[PDB]
C-alpha cells in the first residue's frame, strides 16, 4: 500500500508514519511518500489511495504541491477507494469536509470517516495506528 502526504511542520507526516505502523502491525507492507516524490502512474495501480494534508490557507488543501496533485489524478480515480487524513490547527475540520465531498464528487468511495488531529498527534497516536488497521482490513 501507499500513503501520500504533504506536511509543512511534520504534524501530518507523523500521522502518516503512525498510520503505516498500523498497516504493518496488520502484516501488510506500506510505503509513505511525500507528495513531491510521488509517481502518479504507480500510485494509480493501488486499490486504495491513502491521502493526507494539513489545513492550509483559509481551510483549503496546500496550494503549491498537494492541490495540483489532486487535480492531476481527479480524472483517473473514479471508483477507487480512498482514505483521508490530516492535521489542523484552529478550525474544526472544514478543509477535510470539503476534501471528502470533493473526492466523492470525483467518483471515489471514501472508505472510512477522515481522520483529523489537532496539531501534533501525541495523545491521538493510537487513533492514527487504529485508522491504519481499519484501512488494512478493507
Ligand atoms: C499558512 C497556514 C494556514 C493554515 N490554515 C489553517 C486553517 O484554515 N484551519 C486550521 O485549522 N488550521 C490551519 N493551519 C494550521 C495547520 O493546519 C496546523 O498547524 C497543522 O498541525 C500543520 O500540519 P503540518 O505540520 O503537517 O503541516 C494553517 C497553518 C498555516 C501555516
Amino acid at each position: 500500500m501507499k500513503i501520500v502526504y504533504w506536511s509543512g511542520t511534520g504534524n501530518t507526516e507523523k500521522m502518516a508514519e503512525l498510520i503505516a505502523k498500523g498497516i504493518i502491525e496488520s502484516g501488510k507492507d506500506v510505503n509513505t511518500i511525500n507528495v513531491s516524490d510521488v509517481n502518479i502512474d504507480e500510485l494509480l495501480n493501488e486499490d486504495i489511495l491513502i491521502l493526507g494534508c494539513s489545513a492550509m490557507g483559509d481551510e483549503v488543501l496546500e496550494e503549491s504541491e498537494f492541490e495540483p496533485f489532486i487535480e492531476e489524478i481527479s480524472t483517473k480515480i473514479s471508483g477507487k477507494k480512498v482514505a483521508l487524513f490530516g492535521s489542523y490547527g484552529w478550525g474544526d475540520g472544514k478543509w477535510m469536509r470539503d476534501f471528502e465531498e470533493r473526492m466523492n464528487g470525483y467518483g471515489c468511495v471514501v472508505v472510512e470517516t477522515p481522520l483529523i488531529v489537532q496539531n501534533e498527534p501525541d495523545e491521538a497516536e493510537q487513533d492514527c495506528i487504529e485508522f491504519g488497521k481499519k484501512i488494512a482490513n478493507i
Side-chain angles (χ1 to χ4, degrees):
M1 303 186 90
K2 300 194 188 315
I3 297 175
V4 178
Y5 68 92
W6 182 85
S7 185
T9 75
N11 296 158
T12 303
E13 182 176 7
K14 184 58 190 164
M15 290 179 68
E17 292 179 350
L18 293 165
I19 292 170
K21 193 178 190 296
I23 294 172
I24 297 172
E25 290 194 7
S26 298
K28 306 187 179 184
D29 210 323
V30 62
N31 272 113
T32 64
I33 315 161
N34 187 286
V35 66
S36 60
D37 307 323
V38 70
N39 178 265
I40 306 301
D41 314 296
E42 283 298 309
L43 183 68
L44 295 187
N45 282 315
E46 295 289 337
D47 188 56
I48 303 181
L49 302 178
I50 305 157
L51 316 172
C53 182
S54 50
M56 290 292 295
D58 183 23
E59 299 289 348
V60 295
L61 289 181
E62 190 274 332
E63 300 165 290
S64 74
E65 297 189 74
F66 201 84
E67 167 76 46
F69 157 72
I70 294 301
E71 218 55 51
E72 187 167 40
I73 67 172
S74 69
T75 51
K76 306 132 186 167
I77 59 180
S78 193
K80 282 197 146 52
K81 306 178 190 298
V82 301
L84 314 173
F85 70 101
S87 182
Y88 65 104
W90 51 80
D92 61 23
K94 179 59 173 165
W95 103 107
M96 188 51 84
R97 290 196 282 285
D98 281 353
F99 188 15
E100 178 179 13
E101 286 299 308
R102 187 210 285 246
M103 295 311 273
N104 213 271
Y106 290 154
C108 302
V109 45
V110 178
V111 299
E112 274 288 348
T113 300
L115 177 74
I116 63 175
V117 172
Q118 193 183 1
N119 304 300
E120 187 191 28
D122 205 287
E123 299 86 39
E125 286 192 341
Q126 198 56 224
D127 292 339
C128 296
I129 293 173
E130 292 308 316
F131 182 66
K133 297 198 179 200
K134 285 186 184 63
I135 301 318
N137 241 82
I138 295 164

